[PDB]
Amino acid sequence: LKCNKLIPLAYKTCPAGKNLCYKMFMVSNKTVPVKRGCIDVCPKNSLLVKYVCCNTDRCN
């Protein structure tokens, strides 16, 4: 699987163990991403930090 980068055009393939995409959002702006990469297991959303995972290409 492949996920987009922070700067909306670049991308990177998920290493071994990582076949899912994830995005780190901060309450400061749940409408804007702070971090993005690959993940093996989706975390749990928080009241402050929001973690979203996708199983699609260039989802995030």
Side-chain angles (χ1 to χ4, degrees):
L1 206 86
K2 299 86 108 213
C3 330
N4 212 244
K5 302 253 290 181
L6 212 183
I7 286 269
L9 91 300
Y11 58 97
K12 179 224 68 215
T13 309
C14 309
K18 271 180 286 135
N19 78 109
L20 280 137
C21 303
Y22 90 75
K23 68 185 56 132
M24 239 193 104
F25 278 46
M26 301 236 124
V27 90
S28 66
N29 198 334
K30 245 193 285 272
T31 302
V32 170
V34 93
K35 286 204 106 183
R36 271 123 71 81
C38 299
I39 211 163
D40 58 296
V41 70
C42 202
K44 190 148 87 152
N45 60 73
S46 314
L47 76 116
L48 183 131
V49 66
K50 177 101 162 251
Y51 303 104
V52 168
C53 315
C54 33
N55 60 339
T56 29
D57 268 42
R58 261 127 86 160
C59 52
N60 74 256

